[PDB]
Ligand binder design. Structure first.
Ligand code: GUN
Ligand code: GUN
Ligand code: FE
Ligand code: FE
Lengths: 419, 419
């Protein structure tokens, strides 16, 4: 199974700069990149060449945080702060997933939107419902894209119409794990406690045991809202900071861990994140829409902390990680300005790096056009943006700032075209 | 000329709420709204009905600040704050408008982009060049959209490739004024000193005299960047604040005046703005892109200050005022958070109000569906956004957050369809 793609390649091997290869070739064998060069090796001559001409080829987007079950509230109900917000629109929407048919329907729309926007790998929070989450697993597997799917664990202080017993929660979680742990190579389970204020100690310890037992990655929320933070230290008077409680249960780095937002994290929480090698998911659109605050990304990057990007949909108003890239840069420009121009804002390559190679690394060797990497890619047709007047770097930047899904001509995950 | 439109009408008579009229009629005579009602009067029973069915009809977008000559820099060169950005990217690009053909080509692309995005009235900054600006006037008159066009006055501390002397600057400005202060009814001239840092006392004085003589509106920039502000106090050592400099020369409210950004305005400047009935043009996208800062919109609205929106293109990355609306709201949410939640963020209706009825009032009776107003409108087809699941308010919000020009099916200016 060999495929050869030709076009203008743009990717980031490192965060400081773009690697640009005009009219170059990418040879894919069994879904993985075997060769990337400006000249087609003779050992591959005679093979069909999928020539994308003057179009741009870039790696796919890797969204490390999105709530699949909140798709319907996209662009709606953003007049309340995190906690109040959940109670008014989010919980009522997620509760609807008790019905598997509603789930099939909504997740169907979600998946088509993700692919349409060029998201090739995504870390998703589903709902506490087992059957609907199982349906999401199957639909994702059928779609061809990669993903970490997490049945949501929430048994504490939740609404009567959207709550669960920790005993059932754990049994359902483990049941899901056993069913999908070895099924697909790109759609896998991930331990997903919603967050401290929603999980009892019983639940968290049980989830911690599951993560260890099955060597599974973890995902959850961290220091997104001030009131949220006050609730955590209130329920847990023995903790000095938010992330400490997760760590107490073995859900803070023992295995690859994703922590969303991390806007108001204290110095200690930051050090722990660094120490335990936790990955921070920067969700700028969500931070703006919910009025959560503005994350100091340069400060975290200076400390060597792993930072990726997430759409955090519903809270975040868009599935396009390209739009998330723009907002991350814009958010960083304000941090730069407030710091007296000391904390350099993000360059286009740095944010693009987060979206591709860095985020992709959570899923495996994906996110860059280098030998051995899965071929997750997008073909960008920017013919409506006067491309003739700009170099390749400017064209990618303009696609990011001025373009949209209309410019995405093709999607590939592990060498397979996704429709 | 009589025309009758039917569809779901959404507009804002006031900023606090939307007026929604499902399947209602708008009768237009000679370009102005004759009536707006759920039922069509018997008087027109024989007239054809332009039925837009389930589509949405909203007034056009009124962009109160954009640099027409910067169209080519959209999406690129945003890695520098104001001053160095001007010296390195903007001035060099504007210098090319010495060539009238480059101007016709570039301005042609601009106009198509504005119309495509639903901007029906726009306040534009051209370049200091007389011939190219005259061409812009002519092209806008041909296009059919409304606009205030301003040859840019800049004679102080400007590069050799982009400067003029105040005498010639004033002569060309008056030449243009006499040539267009009657020609078109919706495309008119506006006094345009670029801003204090590049305008001599002689120029500003001469411009204030022209403004008074021909009773013309004024448009400029105000307290957008800290270094810019520092330059003004340094050049005008006796001024108490930036805005005072413009007022000294009669360029601060004697006639309708537009002042863009107003991010770092002092308490005294703000009071002068309210006192002199000056209009603040909020340009959120630009403020993020150049790391200028974040404008405190609620603080100004609480003082009863006039506030409208501008794309500020090039600095701002998009001609879509719908995107600008989203950004203004998001920017306000962060200000709300930093104010301990005391200064409420903008509601969708408030920002929409700025873009329509308020911004429109600067051009005349435009921006709302009420008797007497010019019929500037857009027909939104949101069929790709699962409209069947949302009410009209939600549909509009979803168009603002998730939609784009592809949902803009038709646009009208003064009752005439614009292609
Ligand atoms: N962004 C976000 N944070 C959360 N914390 C708990 N629930 C949620 C949710 O649904 N969205
Ligand atoms: N945003 C912005 N501010 C300015 N101040 C002076 N010139 C400019 C310009 O071109 N853009
Ligand atoms: Fe989230
Ligand atoms: Fe400007």
């Amino acid at each position: 199974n060999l495929k050869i793609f030709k076009g203008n390649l743009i990717f980031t091997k490192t965060s400081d700069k773009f690697t640009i290869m005009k009219d170059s070739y990418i040879v894919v064998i069994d879904g993985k990149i075997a060769s990337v060069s400006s000249n087609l090796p003779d050992k591959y001559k005679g093979n069909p060449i999928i020539d994308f001409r003057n179009n741009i080829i870039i790696p796919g987007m890797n969204d490390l945080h999105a709530h699949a079950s909140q798709y319907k509230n996209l662009g709606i109900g953003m007049d309340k702060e995190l906690l109040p917000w959940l109670n008014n629109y989010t919980f009522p929407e997620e509760a609807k997933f008790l019905n598997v048919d509603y789930a099939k329907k909504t997740y169907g729309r979600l998946i088509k939107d993700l692919i349409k926007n060029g998201t090739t790998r995504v870390a998703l929070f589903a709902t506490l419902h087992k059957d609907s989450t199982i349906e999401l697993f199957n639909m994702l597997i059928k779609s061809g894209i990669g993903a970490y799917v997490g049945k949501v664990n929430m048994d504490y202080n939740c609404p009567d119409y959207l709550t669960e017993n920790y005993i059932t929660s754990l049994n359902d979680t483990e049941e899901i794990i056993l069913k999908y742990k070895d099924k697909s190579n790109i759609v896998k389970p991930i331990i997903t406690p919603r967050f401290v204020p929603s999980c009892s100690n019983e639940l968290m310890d049980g989830l911690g045991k599951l993560s260890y037992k099955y060597r599974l990655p973890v995902q959850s929320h961290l220091s997104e809202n001030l009131d949220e933070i006050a609730v955590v230290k209130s329920l847990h008077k023995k903790s000095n900071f938010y992330g400490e409680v997760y760590d107490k249960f073995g859900l803070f780095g023992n295995t690859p861990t994703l922590m969303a937002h991390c806007i108001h994290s204290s110095k200690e929480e930051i050090n722990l994140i660094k120490r335990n090698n936790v990955t921070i998911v920067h969700c700028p659109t969500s931070n703006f829409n919910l009025g959560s605050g503005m994350m100091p990304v340069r400060k975290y990057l200076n400390l060597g902390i792993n930072v990726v990007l997430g759409s955090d949909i519903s809270a975040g108003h868009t599935c396009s990680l390209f739009k998330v890239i723009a907002y991350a840069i814009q958010n960083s420009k304000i941090k730069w300005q407030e710091s007296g121009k000391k904390d350099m804002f993000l360059s286009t390559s740095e944010a693009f790096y987060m979206a591709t190679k860095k985020g992709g690394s959570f899923f495996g060797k994906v996110g860059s056009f280098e030998e051995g990497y899965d071929f997750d890619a997008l073909v960008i047709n920017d013919s409506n943006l006067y491309p003739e007047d700009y170099d390749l770097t400017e064209r990618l930047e303009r696609f990011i700032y001025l373009g949209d899904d209309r410019n995405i001509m093709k999607r590939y995950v592990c060498g397979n075209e996704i429709f």
